[PDB]
Amino acid sequence: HMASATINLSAEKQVIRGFGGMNHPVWISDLTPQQRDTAFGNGEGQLGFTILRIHVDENRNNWSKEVATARRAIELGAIVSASPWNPPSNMVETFTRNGVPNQKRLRYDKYGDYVQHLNDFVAYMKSNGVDLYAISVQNEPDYAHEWTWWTPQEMLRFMRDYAGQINCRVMAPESFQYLKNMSDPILNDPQALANLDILGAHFYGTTVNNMPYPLFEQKGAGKELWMTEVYVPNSDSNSADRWPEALEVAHNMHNALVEGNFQAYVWWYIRRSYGPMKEDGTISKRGYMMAHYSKFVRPGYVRVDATKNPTYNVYLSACKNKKDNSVVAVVINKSTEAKTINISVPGTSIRKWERYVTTGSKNLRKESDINASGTTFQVTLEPQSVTTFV
């Protein structure tokens, strides 16, 4: 009977779209068959991912390499989003930016040709059994040292005057740090906004105080909100099993969900030595952090209002399955001390929670059931742990 938390099943927040990661079979090896199942299956020892991100290659001859993985992801119940880094080079020109020469942008007179390039990728994937959920205007247009820059006004012009011709949901702007100057002109222009379907954002260096977005809450009715790329807290070689470091992954997810009202959370490369899947095809500690959300908070579940930080170092989120009004709670205890929370879930008729727990020395270990007293579930959290209650 230490701290208390209330989950309010009647205060619905964002509908969850899902969780996943990038495949990029031109820059790195494709996922193998085994790895596609491990990522997108939701069996024991699988990550339960329901979102695959891919890239739109500037060279249409590479497009075929995306197919086997994307098909396999959709077959396993995932949706697919695609992002471009560069237009084909005959559509690009160089310019000087902040004193740095030879930077790339899309030519003003090729915006129409670009729309066609994107549409061709959409058409080609569709012919190969991959109906993209969405396609993006540009990956990180505001951090394009090594790819194609778009100023806020260049993105706005594309969104306002060209993007309605795209034969798919349109995602934008994919700021590297969710910088609101990239997206505010879209929300503030009614035709740009009408052509937007998915506001996408990456989280590199994004502090929790920059996760709320008042202008999107006010103007974004009917648009989805996705965190389409991050790794945290670093991409250090062989860092994926580091502990307690990996708790940072759970906490970022938490914050995306609860401070950012994000509908999706998408890692960078699924398979990588700092990623949710290690190079041997097994799940890392970072991976298990994602799995606490991805295996149990399924698409279509709806986040509900819940005491987010009941005591120091403890973070709670809750999502409702609207079919039976069952709840999934993901509780992170970064403390070196054990914590006991009285979780009040008024009006629920559920009376038993199962729980799975990851620490430095175990992964999703199923532990003893929680039996409610009335509508209150008393839970104990091990030091430096994450627990999903289902």
Side-chain angles (χ1 to χ4, degrees):
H1 68 72
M2 268 189 54
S4 55
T6 300
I7 299 173
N8 182 358
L9 292 171
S10 278
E12 298 185 351
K13 299 293 182 142
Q14 75 267 27
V15 179
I16 301 303
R17 189 61 62 237
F19 306 89
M22 184 84 182
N23 182 64
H24 202 308
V26 176
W27 289 349
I28 73 168
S29 296
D30 193 8
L31 291 186
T32 64
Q34 282 72 20
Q35 294 167 1
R36 290 163 194 166
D37 294 335
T38 307
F40 299 100
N42 200 26
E44 285 171 10
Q46 306 173 323
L47 284 160
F49 292 174
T50 51
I51 301 175
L52 168 70
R53 190 178 173 236
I54 63 174
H55 89 291
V56 175
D57 206 279
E58 63 215 72
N59 183 335
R60 71 200 284 142
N61 286 349
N62 286 322
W63 289 355
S64 69
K65 297 167 192 195
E66 307 302 319
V67 172
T69 298
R71 291 181 336 213
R72 187 49 172 171
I74 286 166
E75 188 161 30
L76 292 170
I79 63 176
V80 182
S81 190
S83 315
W85 270 246
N86 300 292
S89 63
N90 60 15
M91 294 187 203
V92 158
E93 65 185 2
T94 67
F95 74 105
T96 295
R97 182 191 178 288
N98 294 178
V100 186
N102 202 51
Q103 304 304 285
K104 305 205 190 76
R105 71 188 174 203
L106 183 62
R107 290 170 48 166
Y108 293 10
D109 68 357
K110 295 287 177 186
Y111 278 29
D113 303 80
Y114 192 58
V115 164
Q116 187 64 61
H117 166 78
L118 293 178
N119 272 345
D120 286 1
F121 184 81
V122 168
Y124 173 78
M125 298 300 302
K126 186 188 167 95
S127 322
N128 285 263
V130 178
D131 291 358
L132 302 178
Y133 196 84
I135 197 161
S136 180
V137 176
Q138 175 63 56
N139 172 258
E140 293 188 6
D142 62 350
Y143 203 80
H145 304 285
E146 302 188 9
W147 50 83
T148 304
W149 292 99
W150 309 50
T151 67
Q153 290 301 313
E154 289 164 353
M155 182 55 72
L156 168 58
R157 165 189 195 219
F158 189 87
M159 286 300 311
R160 190 183 51 205
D161 300 325
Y162 292 85
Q165 309 184 70
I166 291 167
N167 295 323
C168 192
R169 300 188 183 79
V170 179
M171 181 190 284
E174 296 197 279
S175 172
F176 75 103
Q177 184 169 103
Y178 199 16
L179 297 177
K180 311 310 180 290
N181 66 351
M182 272 317 290
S183 59
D184 278 357
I186 306 163
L187 305 180
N188 280 331
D189 187 274
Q191 172 73 115
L193 171 64
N195 291 330
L196 184 66
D197 304 285
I198 306 187
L199 200 163
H202 294 1
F203 259 20
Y204 291 113
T206 302
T207 62
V208 166
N209 73 114
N210 287 128
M211 298 176 184
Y213 193 5
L215 186 59
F216 181 85
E217 296 174 37
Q218 162 196 7
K219 302 214 184 162
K223 311 296 170 183
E224 307 192 17
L225 184 63
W226 289 34
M227 200 298 288
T228 54
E229 197 192 308
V230 87
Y231 51 69
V232 290
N234 54 62
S235 52
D236 293 350
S237 152
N238 305 121
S239 57
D241 285 336
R242 286 182 188 163
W243 195 265
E245 187 190 68
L247 288 162
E248 298 313 300
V249 178
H251 192 177
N252 196 239
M253 290 185 65
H254 176 266
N255 289 330
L257 294 177
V258 165
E259 306 285 342
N261 297 302
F262 283 86
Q263 295 179 276
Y265 186 104
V266 187
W267 201 262
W268 185 233
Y269 290 151
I270 290 172
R271 190 203 61 235
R272 218 57 174 167
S273 74
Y274 60 90
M277 178 188 303
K278 294 184 281 176
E279 293 291 355
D280 66 6
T282 62
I283 303 179
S284 70
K285 295 283 187 192
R286 284 179 185 191
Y288 288 114
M289 304 293 84
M290 304 194 73
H292 274 275
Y293 293 94
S294 67
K295 302 186 50 69
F296 309 95
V297 180
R298 305 303 296 169
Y301 283 29
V302 65
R303 195 183 73 89
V304 304
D305 192 27
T307 315
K308 65 189 188 176
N309 183 210
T311 182
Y312 200 84
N313 268 335
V314 181
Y315 301 99
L316 175 153
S317 60
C319 301
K320 181 167 77 167
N321 179 343
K322 287 178 71 52
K323 287 203 195 292
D324 57 15
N325 293 138
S326 60
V327 210
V328 179
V330 181
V331 191
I332 298 168
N333 185 13
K334 295 176 113 183
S335 179
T336 46
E337 288 69 59
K339 302 288 161 184
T340 304
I341 314 298
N342 287 321
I343 301 165
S344 176
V345 190
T348 187
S349 61
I350 291 187
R351 294 286 178 284
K352 188 156 59 58
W353 284 343
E354 297 163 291
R355 69 176 167 118
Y356 299 87
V357 182
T358 303
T359 62
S361 72
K362 64 193 178 178
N363 303 319
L364 296 166
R365 197 180 276 173
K366 202 181 155 62
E367 297 288 348
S368 57
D369 291 349
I370 311 302
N371 294 301
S373 174
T375 54
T376 295
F377 295 73
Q378 188 175 83
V379 305
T380 289
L381 320 157
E382 274 170 80
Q384 296 179 297
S385 70
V386 179
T387 301
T388 302
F389 297 100
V390 301

